[PDB]
Amino acid sequence: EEKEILWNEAKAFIAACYQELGKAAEVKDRLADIKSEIDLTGSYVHTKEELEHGAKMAWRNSNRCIGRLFWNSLNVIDRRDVRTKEEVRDALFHHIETATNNGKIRPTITIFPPEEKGEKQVEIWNHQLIRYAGYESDGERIGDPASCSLTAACEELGWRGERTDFDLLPLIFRMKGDEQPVWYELPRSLVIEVPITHPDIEAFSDLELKWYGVPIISDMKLEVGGIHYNAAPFNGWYMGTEIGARNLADEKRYDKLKKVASVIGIAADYNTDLWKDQALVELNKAVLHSYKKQGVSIVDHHTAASQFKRFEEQAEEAGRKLTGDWTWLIPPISPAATHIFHRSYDNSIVKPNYFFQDKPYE
Amino acid sequence: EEKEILWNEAKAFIAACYQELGKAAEVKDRLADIKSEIDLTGSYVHTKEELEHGAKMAWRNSNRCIGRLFWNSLNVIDRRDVRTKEEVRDALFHHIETATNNGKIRPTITIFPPEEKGEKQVEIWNHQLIRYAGYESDGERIGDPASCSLTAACEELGWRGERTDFDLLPLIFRMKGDEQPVWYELPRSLVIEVPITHPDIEAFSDLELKWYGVPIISDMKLEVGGIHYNAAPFNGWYMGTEIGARNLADEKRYDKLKKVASVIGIAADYNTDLWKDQALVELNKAVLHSYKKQGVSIVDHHTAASQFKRFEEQAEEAGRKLTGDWTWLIPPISPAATHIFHRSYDNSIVKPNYFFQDKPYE
Ligand code: HEM
Ligand code: HEM
Ligand SMILES: C[C@H](O)[C@H](O)[C@H]1CNc2nc(N)[nH]c(=O)c2N1
Numbered sequence: 001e002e003k004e005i006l007w008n009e010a011k012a013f014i015a016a017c018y019q020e021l022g023k024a025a026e027v028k029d030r031l032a033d034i035k036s037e038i039d040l041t042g043s044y045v046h047t048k049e050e051l052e053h054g055a056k057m058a059w060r061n062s063n064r065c066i067g068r069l070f071w072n073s074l075n076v077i078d079r080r081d082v083r084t085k086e087e088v089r090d091a092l093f094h095h096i097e098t099a100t101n102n103g104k105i106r107p108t109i110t111i112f113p114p115e116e117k118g119e120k121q122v123e124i125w126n127h128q129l130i131r132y133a134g135y136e137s138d139g140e141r142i143g144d145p146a147s148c149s150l151t152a153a154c155e156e157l158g159w160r161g162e163r164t165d166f167d168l169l170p171l172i173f174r175m176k177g178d179e180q181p182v183w184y185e186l187p188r189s190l191v192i193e194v195p196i197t198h199p200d201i202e203a204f205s206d207l208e209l210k211w212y213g214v215p216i217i218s219d220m221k222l223e224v225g226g227i228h229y230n231a232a233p234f235n236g237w238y239m240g241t242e243i244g245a246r247n248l249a250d251e252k253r254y255d256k257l258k259k260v261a262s263v264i265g266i267a268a269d270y271n272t273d274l275w276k277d278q279a280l281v282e283l284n285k286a287v288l289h290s291y292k293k294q295g296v297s298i299v300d301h302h303t304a305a306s307q308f309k310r311f312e313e314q315a316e317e318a319g320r321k322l323t324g325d326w327t328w329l330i331p332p333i334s335p336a337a338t339h340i341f342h343r344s345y346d347n348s349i350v351k352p353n354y355f356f357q358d359k360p361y362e
Numbered sequence: 363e364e365k366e367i368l369w370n371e372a373k374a375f376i377a378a379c380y381q382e383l384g385k386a387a388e389v390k391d392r393l394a395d396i397k398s399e400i401d402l403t404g405s406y407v408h409t410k411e412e413l414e415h416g417a418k419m420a421w422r423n424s425n426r427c428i429g430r431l432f433w434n435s436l437n438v439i440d441r442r443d444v445r446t447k448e449e450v451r452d453a454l455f456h457h458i459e460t461a462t463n464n465g466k467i468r469p470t471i472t473i474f475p476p477e478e479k480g481e482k483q484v485e486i487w488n489h490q491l492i493r494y495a496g497y498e499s500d501g502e503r504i505g506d507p508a509s510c511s512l513t514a515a516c517e518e519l520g521w522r523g524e525r526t527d528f529d530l531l532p533l534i535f536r537m538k539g540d541e542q543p544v545w546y547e548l549p550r551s552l553v554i555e556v557p558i559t560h561p562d563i564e565a566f567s568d569l570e571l572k573w574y575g576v577p578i579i580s581d582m583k584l585e586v587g588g589i590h591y592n593a594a595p596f597n598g599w600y601m602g603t604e605i606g607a608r609n610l611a612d613e614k615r616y617d618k619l620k621k622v623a624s625v626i627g628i629a630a631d632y633n634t635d636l637w638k639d640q641a642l643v644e645l646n647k648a649v650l651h652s653y654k655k656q657g658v659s660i661v662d663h664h665t666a667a668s669q670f671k672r673f674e675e676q677a678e679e680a681g682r683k684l685t686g687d688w689t690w691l692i693p694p695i696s697p698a699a700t701h702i703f704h705r706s707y708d709n710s711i712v713k714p715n716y717f718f719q720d721k722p723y724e
């Protein structure tokens with residue numbers, strides 16, 4: 001009964017994949033081998049070409065992603081060969097190193113062995129390979145609240161954070177057959193961070209803000225032709241607003257707008273002064289300026305939206321249906337200044353794609 | 363077959379209305395009289411209490427409206443007695459005068475006779491009672507492009523605009539039985555306008571921007587218990603962003619962001635400078651400052667969202683389901699700074715409500 005779902009998704013995927021690669025004639029024979037493989041083993045194994053293209057298709061189908069113009073240049077790393085936690089660890093270290101690329105970020109995915117009987121071979125606990133810890137204890141708020149539960153979970157495993165506002169969480173994942181995950185401290189040499197300064201307001205440094213260079217989502221499931229890659233961390237480069245308008249701005253995150261208003265020399269007393277709006281703009285300018293000055297890749301929301309429009313045009317020219325989530329595609333500052341705001345998007349789910357998974361902690 | 367739809371909507375409305383007014387015991391007898399009235403005449407007539415409460419309920423059900431906290435203080439003007447175009451004209455003039463209230467704006471609706479056999483007694487062509495004309499002719503762009511088609515239609519009726527960027531369109535409506543609408547020039551004494559200045563950037567006046575005080579939507583259908591009030595203009599006061607982030611900012615509208623960037627002394631060369639975002643903030647600050655200085659009612663998007671949150675809480679306490687359109691409720695600047703951005707809204711349609719109608723021009 002499980003073969004049936006796998007087999008149908010496999011047919012849809014290979015037919016569409018090989019079609020796009022111009023391998024339309026090799027479908028029938030490839031489908032046969034897969035049909036046999038499923039019969040024998042209860043599953044099938046992707047060729048490196050299918051795996052690579054499937055990961056690209058999945059990115060192209062990510063309704064919430066504004067950066068999809070570059071779907072076809074994704075660097076896919078096939079690590080389905082890993083069997084030990086040392087190999088997982090070094091694969092994760094390598095992903096960080098190669099995707100970072102000394103600041104000139106390469107969009108990269110590292111693909112680990114897929115679920116077998118729904119049984120995970122590797123289970124990554126981190127939301128992102130690089131992220132800051134969070135602590136709350138009796139009035140105290142330190143670090144990133146979005147990381148509070150994972151941080152508490154790590155401190156159940158013998159790890160202890162310094163309790164600065166920017167503790168790097170260790171990598172934490174569990175191997176099949178083990179009851180507890182293991183954790184490895186990140187080598188600081190691998191992690192680029194960017195101190196946030198303002199182009200012309202020098203007092204901005206007094207906030208002592210910083211953020212990490214590369215956002216590497218590590219807790220989503222990649223689904224390709226019925227195959228479930230629960231462990232397949234991926235990264236692009238940041239859009240400035242993700243850091244300046246959300247991570248550093250949200251009240252449930254770092255909540256820095258009042259402090260920003262102070263250092264840029266404006267009052268934070270009256271809603272009608274639009275001080276939050278003004279602080280958001282200056283904070284987002286500082287973020288863009290800082291990453292650029294540091295030689296770390298980043299994109300502003302206007303350029304990103306322009307690129308996304310080219311993605312829309314490209315899709316129309318190629319005869320492909322466009323899907324998107326309007327509510328996530330619009331940037332959280334000046335959304336009406338982008339074309340995205342003024343059109344509609346079909347939020348249908350197309351596979352291959354990336355999906356949410358339940359968290360092993362909490 | 364038309365009695366059936368009317369009768370069912372009537373039952374739902376009166377039962378719910380009288381329930382809310384505490385007139386639950388008078389439902390059965392009122393429903394009887396209506397049932398007879400429909401049988402005899404093919405329609406029924408609302409009491410002043412039902413009409414008033416129905417208009418309020420309709421506002422409360424307006425999924426796109428962030429200002430719904432004040433639904434119950436709506437000033438309803440019953441003008442179902444009008445029969446002549448002079449009476450319509452004077453009713454419209456009065457609505458403008460009383461809603462304006464010397465700048466301290468009163469949320470007001472004037473209700474004209476409803477459709478009979480789907481036949482309109484009064485058909486208002488204006489989108490808003492007060493709005494600026496728009497012209498495009500061989501390269502020329504003057505005024506408000508959103509008004510181009512209506513403006514062209516008026517100039518087919520013997521009206522001629524001065525072709526400034528802020529020509530007030532005449533009132534234009536058609537009476538039942540007439541083939542063409544009539545138009546009446548607005549008395550300037552009735553129309554408050556606000557010149558846009560900046561609190562601390564005096565060069566902002568060089569843009570010579572202004573906007574009108576009161577937004578009075580005049581082309582939507584009010585539906586109450588099966589009765590279709592196609593002509594029922596209503597107004598609240600502005601939220602600043604409607605003017606500063608859309609009317610004056612959109613490229614398909616007044617398109618003023620480059621000129622704003624110039625007068626506030628910033629470059630408009632690089633996306634990464636976030637000059638559009640900065641210009642939007644300063645333009646929206648100027649709008650709020652200008653209306654306040656002029657003694658004309660206005661609300662900023664932060665205060666408006668706070669009020670809307672109270673509307674959410676009030677709804678929960680009263681046992682009423684909340685409905686809303688997330689995509690319209692979020693303000694077009696700093697939406698993530700409002701609570702609205704971070705929750706979901708059921709976009710179901712509940713009646714009574716206000717609906718779109720096809721435009722007689724275009
Ligand atoms: C190349 C630069 C990229 C940019 C600028 C970009 C931009 C964005 C942004 C701004 C978001 C919203 C994130 C949030 O609000 O938290 C997003 C979401 C997303 N992006 Fe991209 N992205 C990029 C690359 C990629 C890559 C390489 C993949 C995967 C192969 C990807 C898949 C996704 C997915 C799955 C989401 C949704 C995540 C979620 O639901 O939480 N993107 N992207
Ligand atoms: C009291 C002050 C009010 C404020 C601040 C307010 C705020 C708003 C705003 C900002 C919008 C979005 C408009 C746009 O983007 O073009 C809106 C839409 C709307 N409001 Fe209100 N509103 C108010 C009063 C009213 C009143 C009195 C009514 C009717 C009785 C009403 C019914 C609506 C409707 C029907 C829409 C949707 C219009 C459309 O779909 O184009 N509002 N409101
Ligand atoms: C396509 C999209 O639904 C459309 O542009 C909407 C988005 N949200 C909006 N929200 C408001 N308040 N006003 C608008 O005109 C719009 N436009």
Ligand SMILES: C[C@H](O)[C@H](O)[C@H]1CNc2nc(N)[nH]c(=O)c2N1
Binds near residue numbers: 327328703705
């Ligand atoms: C409730 C709402 O859907 C939710 O807050 C969404 C809105 N749009 C978003 N858009 C982006 N890019 N990121 C987010 O986290 C969210 N949050």
Ligand SMILES: NC(=[NH2+])NCCC[C@H](N)C(=O)O
Binds near residue numbers: 215235236237239243
């Ligand atoms: N550009 C991206 N790939 N973003 C992925 C999500 C990152 C997340 N929003 C963050 O601020 O850390």
Ligand SMILES: NC(=[NH2+])NCCC[C@H](N)C(=O)O
Binds near residue numbers: 579597599604605609
């Ligand atoms: N606050 C209101 N009632 N707004 C109604 C819509 C007005 C319209 N958005 C305008 O800018 O003219």
